Write a protein that binds this ligand. Structure first.
Ligand SMILES: Cc1ncc(COP(=O)(O)O)c(CN)c1O
Ligand SMILES: Cc1ncc(COP(=O)(O)O)c(CN)c1O
Lengths: 410, 410
């Protein structure tokens, strides 16, 4: 069982004050904090074995190469891919989904073809598809949501047709906390002749991923959300689909032969990795995976289930607070106070040391569906505790009273 | 005047042995090493103020944002751009040139249009243009080289015509060491109605860049070659051209309004930065710039001029060694030993602690022009010394004798 004191002692950034109060960081769905094992991995790389990779002519070059391809294997095992050929390092989930939209969608869509998404998607899993359908004359459709912000498989079956070529959907929503029924959606897509593209940015850090159980055709994730460095992500795709897609970017490292006018590509996965790679970041993301595997993804999901059930109960104790989304959920709560703008809520909470986010959370169509212009969101990870949730609910109570008193005075 | 002892004391990786001999790192044209100021900048970011950027709702978020946009200003000043709107953070020179090829070239080329490159280009400044001309039915042309591997402006004037829309050329070649006459080539391109795209990956680390003196329309560079983190680069473009180009990637952060089917973009530079950015890396590249500015780019270029004139003299002392390229050059020497394969040269030198590279150096058309299948390359930076060049030339002498003796025995 995970001990939260020992886990928090590994994260130097948690041990500081903001505005004279201990920091209470509740914004890991925007980005997560890093343990010493990850930061010291980057230090050891730049202090001891930095060099360019995939020459293997000299000793430090060999070490850097082994570190970078070593991390590719750690990612393969971490999401249970069959092969390192299916693991592409990218700059982040957004670039991974764009590569699918450019190299897969723009090459396989025709007038009459549909791409199906959902109203709860993050912009990273919306805009690339808007652009690919515009480029190809294909059509974009939205699976509707149920009233608690879940998706019914009957709506999926209704929306997806035999003209659908791509269904793209979030594993977990970073606003509603909904965990979507990806494995059954993948069956529905494949029954209709479509591939499924899964936006895993908010699932991967928080629960075990098995791409062979999900049967997703593509899956995208970001290191910065899962205790790893910024600037790095992964695109997984089934090897038979990657083999037939052309590269999204062109350059050194992803070529085999270059003539004056024509070139041939390397095999996977290097066909999709043009230029000097994100060497230190990918090695640090391998360290993040080792760190999270040592704790156990199931343990971290059990902890977050506890925190989310505690938070939802304690929010129901507050009068005049609306929480969006379903009762069964990932480790976050997006909410509004009646009559206080969420930006003011986040400002007041930061004065008490508490970091949360306010805004649209890069889900404008979802805010429109929720009929609000903005919300506040507290999000949790393996270093948070029930005490910090008490601080949050106590501060929202004081926020409520403070604005009430301001109103009364005015 | 720069003191090399004090500079080398700042780079922890130099102080180690390989194969029982002090390391002699002569492969900075593949990637450079980092000073403590840069590594400690990344540590301080992840230890103290990591958070997502461009919310400014909570205190650490504000600090991370200020750090990231602060580094954008350091880059603007470092290359003398007029505006931060012209400074886009990317993953590296290769991605920066691809963005030009996708968003500029593919949008502005028609049958009959030409893109002009040179035989000495790196693949990053070849393959994207091969693909953009293929996509548009335009034509690719090559400026020829003079016999010493320089470019004559008369050949430029011959090759560039009023059908040319893009001239793309390296500032400095990572194989020949040639510094190309970019400012005069930009005049020739603009006289013909073309833009010029400059591959600055090998110039920026080593000499001062002034984009307003060069008058280049686009300029690309990589952090990992200039003492900064891996995984980050810059695309500079003249603001009036960026304003008319569409984004190359789509997602959160680069939008203003998102509807179900249509979206509008943010202003520059954020229009070109989709998804959570490379926050720590860009802050570390700002630290690299501060480090190099404190030493002085002109001082670092004077040091490398010394090292290159010393190396070329000492290589001319070796019998049976061919050096490629011109006498006036950047800080590198690419060479072959007669009758020893360059891979064997690099292997033997690594056994004496000396790191150099062998291969095509991502310039296959140039190797074909040189009539060789591969070369060896020693490349220098602000932490190298004449003593290390003596070690290199002494080891190449011993390599020569060793293979001679092997031949004799056989
Ligand atoms: C002249 C030149 N151009 C382009 C590149 C590609 O830069 P990156 O690998 O950082 O994308 C390099 C890297 N060696 C280079 O030296
Ligand atoms: C569900 C979801 N999808 C996609 C993204 C985009 O990931 P990145 O900003 O790392 O590219 C995020 C980031 N918050 C997300 O939470």
């Amino acid at each position: 069982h995970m001990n939260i004191t020992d886990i928090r002692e590994q994260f130097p950034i948690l041990h500081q004050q903001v505005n004279g109060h201990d920091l209470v960081y509740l914004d890991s769905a925007a980005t997560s904090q890093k343990p010493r094992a990850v930061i010291e991995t980057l230090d050891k790389y730049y202090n001891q074995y930095n060099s360019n990779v995939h020459r293997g002519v000299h000793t430090l070059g060999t070490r850097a190469t082994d570190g970078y391809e070593g991390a590719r294997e750690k990612v393969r095992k971490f999401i249970n891919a069959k092969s390192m050929a299916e693991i592409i390092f990218t700059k982040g989930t957004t670039t991974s989904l764009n590569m699918v939209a450019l190299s897969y969608a723009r090459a396989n869509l025709k007038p009459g073809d549909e791409v199906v998404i959902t109203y709860m998607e993050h912009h990273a899993n919306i805009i690339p598809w808007q652009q690919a359908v515009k480029a190809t004359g294909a059509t974009l459709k939205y699976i509707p949501l149920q009233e608690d912000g879940t998706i019914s498989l009957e709506d999926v079956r209704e929306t997806v047709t035999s003209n659908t070529k791509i269904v793209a959907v979030s594993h977990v929503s970073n606003v509603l906390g909904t965990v979507n029924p990806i494995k059954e959606m993948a069956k529905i897509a494949h029954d209709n002749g479509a591939v499924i593209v899964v936006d895993g940015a908010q699932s991967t850090p928080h629960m075990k991923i098995d791409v062979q159980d999900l049967d997703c055709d593509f899956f995208a994730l970001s290191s910065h959300k899962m205790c790893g460095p910024t600037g790095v992500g992964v695109l997984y795709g089934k090897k038979a689909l990657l083999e037939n897609m052309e590269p999204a970017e062109f350059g050194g490292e992803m070529i085999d032969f270059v003539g004056l006018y024509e070139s041939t590509w390397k095999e996977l996965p290097w066909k999709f990795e043009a230029g000097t790679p994100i060497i230190a970041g990918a090695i640090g993301l391998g360290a993040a995976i080792d760190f999270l595997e040592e704790i156990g993804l199931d343990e971290i999901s059990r902890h977050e289930h506890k925190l989310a059930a505690y938070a939802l109960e304690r929010f129901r104790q507050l009068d005049g607070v609306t929480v969006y989304g379903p009762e069964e959920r990932a480790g976050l709560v997006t909410f509004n106070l009646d009559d206080v703008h969420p930006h003011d809520v986040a400002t007041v909470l930061d004065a008490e040391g508490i970091a949360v986010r306010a805004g649209h959370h890069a889900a404008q169509p979802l805010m429109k569906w929720l009929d609000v212009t903005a919300t506040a969101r507290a999000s949790f990870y393996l270093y948070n505790t029930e005490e910090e949730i008490d601080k949050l609910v106590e501060a929202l109570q004081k926020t409520k009273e403070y604005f009430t008193n301001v109103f009364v005075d005015l």
